[PDB]
Amino acid sequence: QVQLVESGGGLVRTGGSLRLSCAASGSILQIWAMKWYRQAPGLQREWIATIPNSGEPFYASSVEGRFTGSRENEETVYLYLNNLEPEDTAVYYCEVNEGVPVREYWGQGTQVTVSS
Amino acid sequence: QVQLVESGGDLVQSGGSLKLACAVSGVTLDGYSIGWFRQAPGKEREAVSYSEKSNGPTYYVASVKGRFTISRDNAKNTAYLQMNNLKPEDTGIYYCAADEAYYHERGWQSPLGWPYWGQGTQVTVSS
Amino acid sequence: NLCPFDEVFDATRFASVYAWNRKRISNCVADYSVLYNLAPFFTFKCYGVSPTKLNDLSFTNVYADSFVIRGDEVRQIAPGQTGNIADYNYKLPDDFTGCVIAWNSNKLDSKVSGNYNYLYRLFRKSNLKPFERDISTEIYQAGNKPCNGVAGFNCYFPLRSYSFRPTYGVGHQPYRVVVLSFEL
């Protein structure tokens, strides 16, 4: 019954900021990592960050330096979006890797829209 | 338990010879297969020669065939690598490795297979 | 009558080492040639018998135990070795007769985002017996206070992930390993 819910998307101006959050719930044995992806209009899904349970976050070069991952507890991570650009407009998705054996869980995503 | 100690590395001029030694302690050499490997700056450790336990086969990588000879001395619990006609490309740290296993002729060249290693001896061949 | 190692180990995913898989493959000759469909080169060696003795010898059963570990842990898959893989995940007997095959699987088992699927046991109250498997997930009690199923101070979740990424050095890249035991 592991589930996740993503929040924090919205409409912002260029240069603006958002804080995305991904929170896991249910009968959790061990969270291994949360991963962030985004899917922009007409493009393939793009991996942008991994926030491991053990270890520091790492990122795709398209966002590194501008988006910061934070682990607040084993079930909750943020992705701080700074310096937003129109080309960051996308639906942003959290993937949780959890359990023994390891299973992957997804949600419906959160919309980010960056206006010029 | 198994301890390996290489010696004989030296600076030598191209075309010269060197004999390396791998002194084995803690176990009898006859029960172990022995591999020689070398590591050049910036490169991964690579295979040189193999001597199987129990008087089994010996193998050589193509680039040292006919120049290098692996051997054993049971009295001294030591294995050796005789290196003739040395070339600048032979420069590197030479390591001996040991394993109780019998390797396949095509299965020994990866160094990750091997459990016991010496600290290495430096060989520098000047052009 | 070659054991179809290339067919059975042609798999998207391998077992994690703590949950190592055993396949029984019957009435076949254990031959190295077929491995090259798996990989362009491999470690292949045997304990207690030479690989040459396997030539043309059909076995009533071949037990193939498979899993993924780091390249620099392949050395622990041998009789008499010590360390958390040999002691807590997959243990061979001191007198083992059989063979070890390993190949780099970075292209299949690593991910740019980190492959967290492959786990290993890091903590255990005692060493495994040879060929024992432990797939339990009890919190490991490292002190005198009970953990009550929660990790925390002196209370460890017992498994960890290898988090394989393709940019790791070769020693921490994934290797697929197959251990063969023989029954004439």
Side-chain angles (χ1 to χ4, degrees), chain A residues 1-12 14-43 45-86 88-102 104-107 109-116, chain B residues 2 4-43 45-88 90-127, chain C residues 2-55 57-124 126-143 146-184:
Chain A
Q1 64 182 101
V2 176
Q3 293 176 305
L4 68 85
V5 59
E6 306 128 304
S7 52
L11 169 62
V12 292
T14 297
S17 64
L18 287 169
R19 184 185 77 188
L20 305 184
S21 61
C22 174
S25 60
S27 290
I28 288 162
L29 178 69
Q30 182 64 48
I31 301 277
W32 302 104
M34 265 74 132
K35 301 177 178 183
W36 287 99
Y37 298 77
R38 69 182 174 179
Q39 190 164 12
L43 275 45
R45 202 182 70 199
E46 181 192 12
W47 168 76
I48 63 175
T50 293
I51 300 163
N53 188 52
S54 303
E56 292 183 289
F58 50 99
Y59 307 86
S61 303
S62 57
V63 305
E64 191 190 43
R66 295 180 316 121
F67 296 175
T68 297
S70 184
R71 173 159 294 274
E72 314 282 316
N73 51 50
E74 180 174 331
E75 300 89 357
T76 308
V77 310
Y78 296 152
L79 188 61
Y80 285 91
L81 311 181
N82 302 297
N83 309 116
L84 281 161
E85 299 152 16
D88 299 313
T89 298
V91 179
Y92 284 69
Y93 297 91
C94 182
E95 179 184 50
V96 174
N97 287 182
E98 184 285 324
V100 178
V102 181
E104 297 165 339
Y105 302 91
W106 295 81
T110 193
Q111 176 75 53
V112 175
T113 303
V114 184
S115 55
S116 304
Chain B
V2 180
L4 308 169
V5 176
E6 304 87 344
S7 59
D10 202 359
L11 177 56
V12 68
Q13 185 152 294
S14 188
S17 296
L18 222 43
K19 191 177 188 164
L20 311 187
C22 172
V24 181
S25 314
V27 297
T28 301
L29 167 71
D30 189 55
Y32 284 73
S33 291
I34 297 289
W36 282 96
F37 289 82
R38 61 191 177 179
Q39 181 168 14
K43 288 161 80 86
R45 200 169 294 198
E46 76 186 16
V48 178
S49 183
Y50 164 88
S51 167
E52 186 154 292
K53 64 190 292 174
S54 302
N55 261 323
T58 62
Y59 305 124
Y60 299 89
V61 299
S63 72
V64 310
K65 180 186 80 167
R67 304 182 303 124
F68 292 14
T69 301
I70 191 168
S71 63
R72 292 166 177 247
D73 189 341
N74 283 327
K76 299 181 184 175
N77 224 52
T78 302
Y80 304 89
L81 188 70
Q82 172 72 51
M83 298 183 300
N84 295 328
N85 191 27
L86 279 161
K87 295 165 183 179
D90 298 318
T91 294
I93 294 171
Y94 281 69
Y95 298 91
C96 62
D99 202 339
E100 298 194 83
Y102 303 89
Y103 282 78
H104 191 280
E105 184 177 353
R106 299 297 149 207
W108 64 273
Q109 296 91 340
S110 168
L112 298 168
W114 290 74
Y116 310 106
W117 291 86
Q119 86 291 338
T121 187
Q122 173 71 229
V123 173
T124 304
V125 185
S126 81
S127 88
Chain C
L2 302 186
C3 300
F5 298 139
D6 53 330
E7 303 180 352
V8 304
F9 294 121
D10 186 10
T12 301
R13 305 176 293 290
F14 257 43
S16 292
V17 71
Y18 81 93
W20 53 267
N21 183 277
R22 173 163 287 185
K23 286 195 173 56
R24 178 188 69 85
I25 308 173
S26 56
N27 295 113
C28 56
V29 175
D31 175 25
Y32 91 107
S33 65
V34 304
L35 296 165
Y36 283 120
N37 301 324
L38 295 166
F41 50 91
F42 35 79
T43 291
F44 176 39
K45 62 186 178 174
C46 303
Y47 296 91
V49 58
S50 165
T52 297
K53 292 297 193 188
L54 299 173
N55 297 344
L57 185 55
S58 177
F59 287 100
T60 301
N61 288 296
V62 173
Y63 298 98
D65 294 335
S66 61
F67 47 80
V68 164
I69 56 177
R70 283 164 180 169
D72 68 5
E73 294 177 323
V74 166
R75 63 162 192 83
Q76 285 180 57
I77 310 308
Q81 296 316 290
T82 63
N84 64 296
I85 297 307
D87 289 334
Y88 300 157
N89 292 263
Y90 183 85
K91 174 162 301 282
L92 293 171
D94 289 355
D95 70 333
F96 172 68
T97 300
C99 305
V100 181
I101 299 158
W103 62 100
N104 181 292
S105 59
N106 202 40
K107 291 167 173 186
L108 294 184
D109 286 326
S110 295
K111 293 176 59 160
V112 176
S113 67
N115 187 5
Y116 291 87
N117 287 328
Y118 287 108
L119 311 178
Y120 63 88
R121 192 173 301 279
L122 185 58
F123 299 102
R124 197 178 191 267
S126 59
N127 288 351
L128 295 176
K129 301 170 181 322
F131 298 117
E132 181 180 4
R133 186 186 299 104
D134 182 352
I135 57 165
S136 64
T137 54
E138 294 311 289
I139 303 304
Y140 176 85
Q141 190 185 311
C147 299
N148 302 315
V150 176
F153 180 84
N154 287 6
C155 287
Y156 313 145
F157 197 75
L159 307 183
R160 288 293 178 279
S161 180
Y162 280 124
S163 69
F164 292 117
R165 290 163 69 191
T167 48
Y168 286 175
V170 63
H172 280 196
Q173 287 176 14
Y175 277 67
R176 280 174 180 207
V177 178
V178 171
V179 181
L180 304 180
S181 293
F182 302 99
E183 178 182 346
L184 189 74

